[PDB]
Amino acid sequence: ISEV
Amino acid sequence: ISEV
Amino acid sequence: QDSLPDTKASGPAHSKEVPALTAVETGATNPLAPSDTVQTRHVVQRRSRSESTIESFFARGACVAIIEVDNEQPTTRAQKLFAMWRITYKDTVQLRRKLEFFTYSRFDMEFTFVVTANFTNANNGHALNQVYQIMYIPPGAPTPKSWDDYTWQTSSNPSIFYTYGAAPARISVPYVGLANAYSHFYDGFAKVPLKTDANDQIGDSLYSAMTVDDFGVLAVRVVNDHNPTKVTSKVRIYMKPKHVRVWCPRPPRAVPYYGPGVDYRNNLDPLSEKGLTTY
Amino acid sequence: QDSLPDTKASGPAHSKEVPALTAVETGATNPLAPSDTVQTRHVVQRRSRSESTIESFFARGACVAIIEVDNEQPTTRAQKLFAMWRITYKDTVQLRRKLEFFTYSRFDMEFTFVVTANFTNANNGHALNQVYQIMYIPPGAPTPKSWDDYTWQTSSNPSIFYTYGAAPARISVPYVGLANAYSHFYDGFAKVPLKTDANDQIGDSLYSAMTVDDFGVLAVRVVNDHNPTKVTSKVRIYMKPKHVRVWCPRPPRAVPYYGPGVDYRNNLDPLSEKGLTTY
Amino acid sequence: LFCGSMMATGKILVAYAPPGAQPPTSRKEAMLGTHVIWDLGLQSSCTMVVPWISNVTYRQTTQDSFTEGGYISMFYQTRIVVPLSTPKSMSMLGFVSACNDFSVRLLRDTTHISQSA
Amino acid sequence: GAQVSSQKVGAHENSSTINYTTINYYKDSASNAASKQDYSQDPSKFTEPLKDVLIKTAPALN
Amino acid sequence: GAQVSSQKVGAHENSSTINYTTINYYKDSASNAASKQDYSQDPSKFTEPLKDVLIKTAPALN
Amino acid sequence: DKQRYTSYANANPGERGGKFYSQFNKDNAVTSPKREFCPVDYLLGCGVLLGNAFVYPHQIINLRTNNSATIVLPYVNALAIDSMVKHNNWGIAILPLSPLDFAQDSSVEIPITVTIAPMCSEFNGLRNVTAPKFQ
Amino acid sequence: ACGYSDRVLQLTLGNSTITTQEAANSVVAYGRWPEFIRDDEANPVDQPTEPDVATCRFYTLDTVMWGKESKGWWWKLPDALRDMGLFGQNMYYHYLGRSGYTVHVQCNASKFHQGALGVFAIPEYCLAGDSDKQRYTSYANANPGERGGKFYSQFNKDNAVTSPKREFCPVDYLLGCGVLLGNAFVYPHQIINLRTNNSATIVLPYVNALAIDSMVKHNNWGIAILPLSPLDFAQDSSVEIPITVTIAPMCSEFNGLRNVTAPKFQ
Amino acid sequence: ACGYSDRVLQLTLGNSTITTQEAANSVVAYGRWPEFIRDDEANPVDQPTEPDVATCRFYTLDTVMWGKESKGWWWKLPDALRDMGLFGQNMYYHYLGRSGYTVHVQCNASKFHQGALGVFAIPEYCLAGDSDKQRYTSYANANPGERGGKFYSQFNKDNAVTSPKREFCPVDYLLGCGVLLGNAFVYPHQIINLRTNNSATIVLPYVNALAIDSMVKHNNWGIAILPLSPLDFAQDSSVEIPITVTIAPMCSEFNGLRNVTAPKFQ
Ligand SMILES: CCOC(=O)c1ccc(OCCCCC2CCN(c3ccc(C)nn3)CC2)cc1
Ligand SMILES: CCOC(=O)c1ccc(OCCCCC2CCN(c3ccc(C)nn3)CC2)cc1
Ligand SMILES: *C(=O)CCCCCCCCCCCCC
Ligand SMILES: *C(=O)CCCCCCCCCCCCC
């Protein structure tokens, strides 16, 4: 994932 | 996964 | 957080600092807050400008065209077995006015197609469900002369096949401008008259217009062979700009539009009568 | 990154190096850039050839066939209760011309089927929704003589059952060639006449043609028993080559096609009149 | 490409005028734009590069004054000179190709092929 | 490739930070939805284009 | 089995690298979509098939 | 009545510039049309209200305050460079927001002089000279 | 160093040597030299025959004359070599045969002559026919052997329906195949421009959708020679100079031996 | 190494390129390349204009014809370029202008033609006049522009006293100036001898008693082209071949800008  |  | 600045507590003043006085001749707007001219309390501000961001302002699908196409017995006189529309935001007024708050823009475009149909005549039997072909013809490409000629083969042009009754069709288009930004306004010509020209029509051009075909056309047809009874259909095109950027603000259109340029004709009287000392 | 080379800054020249002169007799194209013949500035280039890659050039579903099938009372005379089509890209011209920029190709094939229907006659009651059977019959397999005979049992042949009104049908086909690549052009024969042959028809063959059945046929029928009223249907087949490779470039077709080979018949005059010293 | 005899000599001016002015009718006007003076000799062929000089980032493939590319013209710089017993007339063949900075976009159908009913 | 962000929660249920998940399905960014996470900026290029920008308590003209 | 790649972003929203996710659902590669990540090559086999390839500033014929 | 029909020679007054009008007089002569602009003052000559023209870069010459206005203009366009002969980048509009008045003399007149300087000028695509037809 | 040049070549194959003092370098089609079938590209399992020097040597075909009206000449490979010594015997005794070629086209004149020959090596050169009838050219007509065929300035449709000629009608500006000749330059080629060079030398690899095929049923390469610029000399209105084509098989290998194929060329 | 030569040159300036396959090397007058005015040689204090590519490019003048009676041609610099594009505009809008030049003279013929052109670049080429009246040639006559002037085999004194022609009378063996032509070789020069070379290429530095001067009032360099050996061909007694002069300004700089100078050439 790329959770901001 | 295989993220290029 | 994206909330607006808090109001500061401000008390009485007797000073040589005068925020309330200025000179608009400079071109500047006076940067004042309530606390510069009246006594204020401390307010922790929670309001925000989330809905007035450029994206949020244009983030809505707007009606830009109503294309009408018939499906009926190919007789032999001007019919509507297929139709063509030049892609533009200028056949409608609402989105046109919104885009024109700005001189230049850059964005991706989302197209949604609502298709409705009905029986044209009192009765001759009925019609089996129709499939519609929406073909994009970019400038240069062969345009159709007939509802089922070879151009509809669409080997390289993008086409949508829409089935009547299905959820409205939707596609996305990249930023496709020949320039670094779209010009909502162009103070110029596509050609210049030269002293050495033969007729003085060689160099004639429409003011403000750029390319002859702009971005091409959407050719629409019913793929179905005609039923005995005629079915008339309308394709409504909704346009939404997404991933939007805009440059150089402009005054909004104040009088009714008169064609694709800035020309005005009438209803040049936008403002109501109100007395000078009347609330 | 996939951008094209930057333009280098190039200044004046007085030298024995002469890029501007060459000899095309060698078979070579002179590898020149603007900076070899004029003074150039430095340009950081961002353009790319992303859309002109082989995959991107063919990445579009093209119309290769219109199969017509009727659903009506099986009377007793030549009807259309079922239809057959030899699979090919040659009944249409647009994709054929694109594939023929190259001598050989290798790819997987995606087939999409758009089905439309209508009432043939003014009126006898109506029709309940139709299911269509599209059966592939590879060479060697029994071909149907009747719309509901045993071949439609399809125990080993692949079949698609399409319901009218549903999203257009779609399948993929592997690379199925008998060779290592598909030959768009074959300068040869399938048979050779021998001096010892009885009639000289034993060894006769069509020039350029390879196998008699190429890749077989698609047999199409309406699975529904006939309504009282006749329904006529058309199945449009869209073909897209995917995972594409091509070899040996060719000049594009300049005059109208005349059948499955390279034969020309007329409109052998492709070029317009333009004066030698006219812009 | 000069397809004349080896005894034939000559100097030719080949040119490119970016759009906006009168299309050249005289060598005098053509000289003023991008150009190459080709001297005929053992190297038989000459190459003039038309540099990308445009206002827009991409021009159209169809005709359009807003995206016009300009004018190419050719003139004799001196003249073709032959000896006696030599043909006084000959052919010039011409070739075109793209430089490594060239690209294209927005795929479309060609008008160069079509099909009857 | 899932992308996770906090929602700006307006009306809070009687049940703290809540999140939403995004995944792009297509290679072309034109196909993507709008992030709607937009940064703002100063109006000064419009409200104050002056070569010598002056402070509000001082005389505009001096 | 998810495959994640960067999009070549054309028009950038006013909100950096964006990604997209791909998963193959079928055993037969013929069923797969097109990656469209295509490497290029030199034109030389066509533009220069010469046994002695010569450099552009030298005389083509010597 | 004809849209986007102003001729190049009329669109481009050169050094002379053009003027504004208090109202819209439609050039009636259809048969041999003037093909000129009809810029109405409160509509900024372009279908919008003049009072909002202040969102554009500007200064006011208010005679009790200042002799002059000085505006520095960057090149603005959808492109880095374009045809200067075909396309104008910037328009300079000078309108009297408040009318000229003096003592009681009902017919006062004072000069307005416009001095302009090009900055960071660069040119590409050299060839023979463009000679436009301004007749 | 020493004195070497782009214009002076010696080609040696088997017991044959070609010299040239006026070449315009030489072309290797698609950048690929001829080579034998590799084990990992191999399809017929039987041990191949490789005749080497006995077949891979220079065969000179019958000379053709170039004059002011000459519209052009064409040849097909392996067909032009079907009767050439032991190459021809190997071709007709085996079901399968692959081979690459060195093509050397010869045409000298004088510094006062003028003209330019376009020499083109085309993969799968399918030619157009005579008739309303499509794909109807007969095998014997499709294959002229060493003689080759010619081009025409225009399309004369073989009208005699009842007893049809079943021949090609190759029109010159259409490259005999429905395309424009000016684009034939995307094919491997050289130009014999008489003020520059005596000759053209093109090295051809085996090109096919298969590693090996039937040489009797299928031609791999077509050789098209068209006058891009017409022959001219002094003022003599009827000039004529010879064009001579010499071709050599390279890396030739054959599979599927049995009794000899005898095609019917009547 | 590779294949380079004294005879084959490419000159590129601005958007212009010249090729030549038959040069006789090239001359740099007095061993000095053109250069800009240095701060320690500077005299006008105002910031100079340097138009660069827009002026320092090749302008081709009108072609002259060389025939058996042609006694010779002359040109003056900057005068021959006064009407040349933006160079001319810069020259007439400024009081001061300095510039160097690349001069390329073009004259091809055939291996059977004969003749030799002497091409001379002369600093301060003062020419002799018409009359009994000394130093009386008028400005308009002294300055032919692009047309240039000619030489004569002998001195015809303009007799008409009453309404005098006020022209030069340049006699060829006296180099039009009272000296013997055979010594003109102490000036920077090349010879176009038709059996050897198609052309001459002379690079000229700015030469003057000052770093910068008035280009309208004063010419710096004279270009004299005289036939050292007469044109001849086969036996045809009236041969004619073109001579073409192409000139490029180099390191051009201008001072003293104001309204445009419009000289009277009537
Ligand atoms: C003329 C004034 O308006 C504009 O300047 C202006 C600027 C930008 C605009 O964006 C549209 C440009 C893209 C044009 C088309 C490109 C492709 N389109 C497609 C393509 C295929 C299908 C099936 N459906 N729609 C539909 C839109 C539209 C108008
Ligand atoms: C004759 C000239 O054209 C060709 O050479 C040529 C080359 C390759 C081509 O690809 C098609 C080969 C595959 C043939 C068929 C294989 C299976 N097909 C199927 C199979 C099942 C179903 C239900 N629907 N379609 C449809 C296509 C088509 C044509
Ligand atoms: C990053 O995305 C890795 C995690 C993937 C989680 C499962 C995604 C399921 C949806 C697949 C999308 C396919 C779009 C073509
Ligand atoms: C690799 O793919 C491991 C991660 C899987 C994430 C969930 C995928 C959900 C979609 C399942 C596809 C089934 C296709 C037959």
Q: Which domain holds residue C222?
A: 1-279
**Spacing, Cα D176 to ligand 2 middle (Å):** 8
One-letter amino acid at C138 equals P
Task: Name every residue whose Cβ is closer than 8 Å to that of residue I20 and which is 6 or more positions away in sequence.
Answer: I7, I8, I9, I10, I198, I199, I201
Residue closest by Cα to atom 13 of ligand 3: G22
Q: How was this structure determined?
A: X-ray
CATH code of I254's domain: 2.60.120.20
Residue whose Cα lies nearest atom 10 of ligand 1: it is C109
Helix-, strand-, coil-residue percentages of chain B, each rounded to 5: 0, 0, 100
Handedness of CA H102, H104, H105, H106 (dihedral sign): positive
Q: Say how far apart CA C55 and CA F35 lie, in whole Å.
A: 9
Among the bound ligands, the one closest to the CA of D113: 2
In the DSSP assignment, the letter for residue D202 is: T
CA distance I136 to I168: 9
Neighbours of chain A (3+ CB pairs under 8 A): F
| DSSP-based three-state secondary structure for D65 | strand
Between CA H20 and CA H54 the distance in angstroms is 18
Quote the tokens at residue D247: 């070899």
Indicate yes or no: CB of G58 within 8 angstroms of CB of J8: no
CA distance I103 to I201: 6
Check if the beta carbon of residue I184 is closer than 8 Å to that of residue I224. Answer: yes
Contact I110, E6 (CB under 8 A): no
Determine contact, residues D264/D128, Cβ cutoff 8 Å: no
Say if residues J97 and J206 touch (Cβ distance below 8 Å): no
Please tell me whether residue F42 adopts helix, strand or coil conformation.
coil
C-alpha distance from F39 to closest chain H C-alpha (Å): 22
CB contact under 8 A, F49 and H57: yes
Q: Going by C-beta distance under 8 Å and a sequence separation of 6 or more, which residues neighbour residue I182?
A: none
Nearest ligand to residue C170 Cα = 1
Amino acid at position E53, single letter: I
Can you tell me the distance from the alpha carbon of E64 to that of C209, in angstroms, rounded to the nearest whole number?
12
* Domain hosting residue I119, numbered range: 1-266
Cα–ligand 1 centroid distance for C96 (angstroms):
14
| C229 half-sphere exposure, CB direction, 13 A CA radius | 15
D89: CATH: 2.60.120.20
Burial of E69 (0-12, 13-18, 19+ CB in 10 A): middle
Contact residues, chain J to chain G, C-beta under 8 Å: 2-4, 8
Nearest CA of chain I to the CA of G55: how many Å? 13
Integer angstrom CA distances of residue D114 from C112, C168, D117, D135: 21, 18, 10, 15
β-strands D62-71, I149-150: how paired? Answer: unpaired
CA angle J121, J123, J124 (to 5 degrees): 125
Burial of J21 by CB count in 10 Å (0-12 exposed, 13-18 middle, 19+ buried)? buried
Mutate to test the pocket of ligand 2, among D64, D67, D87, D211 (most ligand atoms within 8 A of CB): D87
- CA–CA distance, D59 with F27 (Å, rounded to integer): 14
Q: Is D215 in the pocket of ligand 2 (CB under 6 A)?
A: yes
Instruction: Return the ligand 4 atom nearest residue G24 CA.
Output: 14
Amino acid at G26: Y
CB contact under 8 A, J203 and D14: yes
Tell me whether strands E34-39 and E11-17 are parallel, antiparallel or unpaired.
Answer: antiparallel
Q: Which ligand has the nearest atom to the CA of G21?
A: 3
Which residues on chain D are in Cβ contact (under 8 Å) with I126? Answer: 185-187, 207-208, 261-262
Count of Cβ atoms closer than 10 Å to residue D95 Cβ: 24
Q: If we measure between CA atoms, which residue out of I155, C158, E21 comes closest to residue D256? A: I155
Encoded tokens for J135: 């130093």
| Contact G2 CB / ligand 4 (< 6 Å) | yes
Rounded to the nearest angstrom, the distance between the alpha carbon of F24 and the centre of ligand 4 is: 15
Q: Which residues of C190-210 are buried (b: 16+ CB within 10 A; e: fewer)?
A: bebbbeeeeeeeebbbbbbbb
Number of domains in chain J: 1
Q: What is the resolution of this structure in A?
A: 2.8
User: What phi, psi does J230 have (nearest 5°)?
Assistant: -65, 145
- Element holding G46 (H helix, E strand): helix G44-47
Residues with Cβ within 8 Å of I7's Cβ and at least 6 positions away in sequence, in order, are G61, G62, I20, I21, I22, I23, I24, I197
Are 3 or more Cβ–Cβ pairs between E and H shorter than 8 Å?
yes
Asked whether the beta carbons of residue D4 and residue E109 sit closer than 8 angstroms, the reply is no
Which chains have 3+ CB pairs within 8 A of E?
Answer: C, D, G, H, I, J
> What lines the ligand 1 site, CB under 6 Å?
C 87-90, 109, 111, 134, 136, 158-160, 171, 173, 176, 182, 214-215, 218
- Calculate the alpha carbon distances from J255 to H121, J48, J220 in Å: 19, 5, 17
- Residue D134 in contact with residue D217, Cβ under 8 Å? no
CA distances from E95 to E46, E92, E101, G25, I72 (A): 10, 10, 18, 50, 21
Closest Cα partner for J78 from J222, J265, J199, J211? J222
* CATH for G1-62 (3.40.50.300, 3.40.50.1980, 4.10.80.10, 3.40.50.970): 4.10.80.10
Domains of chain F, by residue range, sit at: 1-62
Are B4 and G4 within 8 A, CB to CB?
yes
Tell me if residue J92 falls in helix, strand or coil. helix
Question: Tokens 């000959």 belong to which residue?
Answer: E90
Distance D109 CA to ligand 4 centre (A): 25
Radius of gyration of chain E (CA): 19
F19 forms beta bridges with F6
Check: CB of residue J59 under 8 Å from CB of residue J85.
yes
Cβ contact I98:I90 at 8 Å: no
Do I231 and I66 touch, CB atoms closer than 8 A? yes
Using CA atoms, how far apart are residues J256 and F25, in angstroms rounded to an integer?
66
Site to substitute for ligand 1 among C84, C86, C136, C257, most atoms within 8 A of C-beta: C136
State the DSSP string of chain I. Answer: -TT--TT-EEEEETTEEEEESSB---EEGGG----PPPTTT----SPPB--GGGTSS-EEPPPEEEETT---EEEEETGGGTTSHHHHHHHHHEEEEEEEEEEEEE----TTEEEEEEEEEEET-PPPBSSSSTT---HHHH--GGG-EE-BSS------TTS----B--BGGGTTTTB-GGGGGGSSEEEEETTT-SEEEEEEPP--SSSS--TTTB--EEEEEEEEEEEEESS-TT-EEEEEEEEEEEEEEEEEE-SPP-B---
Whole-number Å distance, alpha carbon J251 to ligand 4 midpoint, is: 70
**J28 burial type by CB count under 10 A (0-12 exposed, 13-18 middle, 19+ buried):** middle
Which residue type is seen at I31? G
Provide the b/e sequence for J82-118 (b: ≥16 CB within 10 Å): bebbbbbbbbbbbbbbbbbbbbbbbbbbbebbbbbbb
Total of domains in chain D: 1
